[PDB]
Symmetry: D2
Subunit: 140 residues, 4 copies
Amino acid sequence: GGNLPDVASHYPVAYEQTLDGTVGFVIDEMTPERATASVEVTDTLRARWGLVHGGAYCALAEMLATEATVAVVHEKGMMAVGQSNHTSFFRPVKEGHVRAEAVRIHAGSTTWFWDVSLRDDAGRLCAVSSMSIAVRPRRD
Amino acid sequence: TGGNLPDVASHYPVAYEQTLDGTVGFVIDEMTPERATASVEVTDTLRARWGLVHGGAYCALAEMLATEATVAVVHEKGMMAVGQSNHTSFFRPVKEGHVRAEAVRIHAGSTTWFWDVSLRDDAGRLCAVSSMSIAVRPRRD
Amino acid sequence: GGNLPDVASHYPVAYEQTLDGTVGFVIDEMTPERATASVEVTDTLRARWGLVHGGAYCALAEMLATEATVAVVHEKGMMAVGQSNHTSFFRPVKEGHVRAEAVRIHAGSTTWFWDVSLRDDAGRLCAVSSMSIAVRPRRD
Amino acid sequence: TGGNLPDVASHYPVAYEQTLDGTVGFVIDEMTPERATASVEVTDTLRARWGLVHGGAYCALAEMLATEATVAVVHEKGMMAVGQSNHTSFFRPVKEGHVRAEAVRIHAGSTTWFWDVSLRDDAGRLCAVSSMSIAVRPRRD
Ligand SMILES: CC(C)(COP(=O)(O)OP(=O)(O)OC[C@H]1O[C@@H](n2cnc3c(N)ncnc32)[C@H](O)[C@@H]1OP(=O)(O)O)[C@@H](O)C(=O)NCCC(=O)NCCS
Ligand SMILES: CC(C)(COP(=O)(O)OP(=O)(O)OC[C@H]1O[C@@H](n2cnc3c(N)ncnc32)[C@H](O)[C@@H]1OP(=O)(O)O)[C@@H](O)C(=O)NCCC(=O)NCCS
Ligand SMILES: CC(C)(COP(=O)(O)OP(=O)(O)OC[C@H]1O[C@@H](n2cnc3c(N)ncnc32)[C@H](O)[C@@H]1OP(=O)(O)O)[C@@H](O)C(=O)NCCC(=O)NCCS
Ligand SMILES: CC(C)(COP(=O)(O)OP(=O)(O)OC[C@H]1O[C@@H](n2cnc3c(N)ncnc32)[C@H](O)[C@@H]1OP(=O)(O)O)[C@@H](O)C(=O)NCCC(=O)NCCS
């Protein structure tokens, strides 16, 4: 169900209707320290100029880092949401796939941080994202 | 244009309705060389599974607005403009209504333009900001 | 005492010996929503290439935003420390002064955020800094 | 060189001991086109009034290391390199000892190089990181 971490019996928005399901993000591997996700490039992932939209790398990094945090913290009573996403763009992608790998670099009580690398089908580094995730007690 | 994006060419590789922006519904309202605005109606397509506007939606609305506001000026000077850095910070979530974005240009150099984007809810509250650095380069073809 | 907010009767490091006092940062105005600070350019503020060091704008923004938060929160039992500082550089400064203005844009329970603008003697925008400040209960 | 900064010119505008870097004591240890390291002994000159290493000290050590590691390669190709964006995030404070910085190059484009800088304490713990984007331009004079 994009293979997002199954941590709750109900979610407000079904995968297929979310932004993630609309553009087609799917999680491959997920561990407490490292997660991967990928997407096929389609027009839905593109801006009008034919290259993958800058926002799509941002969103891929956002979901992967946040959900990789959720995977650990939800069962502990916490919620995780993005608090900063800094994405830098090195090389565009016209077609193929975008593959993201998030490596956890800090896991603090209130903040987790993930380095996300976004690669094309040749393995070339096309973008990176520094993802800062706020971790707070779940609300009643 | 589709999405009211600036019309600076006779044709584009991908039509508005098929692009990310048209799929999620981003629309440009005002556009000038120093300030531009855009908005989007929140629907599920804008949300993460947890029911709030997805962090990547604010990133993408900022990305398109700041980049296109640059394109509007530089394209006819033979330049291309593409996001080079997008730093979005999240202050308050949006569950429903609209997200309204205003991009204010703060630096227009020869190789980089920089825009401060504020993303507000229907109550006017500041829900996210994005610092958008846009690379400007001569067009290749 | 660089005119930093007088919120405590003792501080661990005297102004003149801190990084701030060494390079000469001084706060001019401070309110809950807006603060200003300035520095004379000297070699101490410069890199070996003769222009003001990128780190000096970063540090000016860091102290101004953090201390402008401290000014409000210390009396409430909280500590404030920088958690993210993103500085972008638009135009170098060779000599004169650097003047910083921090405008508060969000004041949340756990995070305050300040937009800092760094201007030369002509008023030109030379750098900006997006300052994210963590606010936490003071420790015993 | 003073601070062991790369020696790529016969003279510099400002001597090491008088610059910010020499005042606070930054020293480069290893330097290669893809990886560089530097360190600094914590003393009060590195601290804010509250007694911890000043957030701007990590920013500045990252700024100098990533920029100079670029200079080491591009200067003799007639290019100048200067910080364009420095995004430093703070995970754990340092009260005393040293701060040790390692810059790993992750992109070397024609106009921008990008380095990931990790800043560690004497126990090896990751206390801060900086994403350093460095503009590379032809030298003017
Ligand atoms: C920003 C920050 C408070 C966020 O907390 P976090 O990411 O949830 O990290 P944690 O809360 O897990 O704690 C990590 C370390 O932060 C410090 N810290 C956290 N909360 C603190 C508090 N309320 N008071 C004092 N120090 C605190 C402690 O050194 C802590 O280590 P410890 O728990 O082993 O004592 C913490 O990351 C931090 O202190 N970063 C450094 C800020 C800094 O040095 N900036 C410049 C200072 S001049
Ligand atoms: C990063 C940068 C080179 C990118 O250029 P840009 O965003 O396109 O801005 P512009 O190129 O329009 O020019 C702005 C100023 O940058 C400087 N600059 C730009 N290219 C330069 C070059 N090749 N050599 C020397 N200075 C240059 C000049 O001061 C220029 O002003 P001028 O054109 O009036 O001489 C430029 O923004 C900059 O120099 N920023 C400051 C970097 C800095 O100070 N970091 C710390 C230094 S120790
Ligand atoms: C990151 C964040 C939790 C940090 O908290 P902060 O800067 O200290 O802000 P505050 O804690 O003052 O609270 C501001 C709003 O955040 C939300 N929030 C804060 N803590 C929360 C929690 N534990 N659970 C749920 N929502 C919370 C609430 O909407 C809150 O408003 P309210 O207090 O009027 O209900 C908060 O800024 C935030 O929620 N930002 C948005 C994150 C986001 O939307 N990312 C993408 C989601 S798909
Ligand atoms: C921002 C950027 C232009 C800066 O250039 P840089 O860091 O110096 O990197 P380089 O210029 O060395 O080149 C990297 C790639 O950028 C692209 N590029 C650079 N200049 C270009 C130009 N004038 N026109 C078209 N593409 C260009 C090319 O794909 C280039 O690869 P190539 O040289 O093998 O053709 C470049 O890093 C980039 O294009 N990043 C991607 C931007 C992006 O995809 N954002 C979203 C688009 S919708």
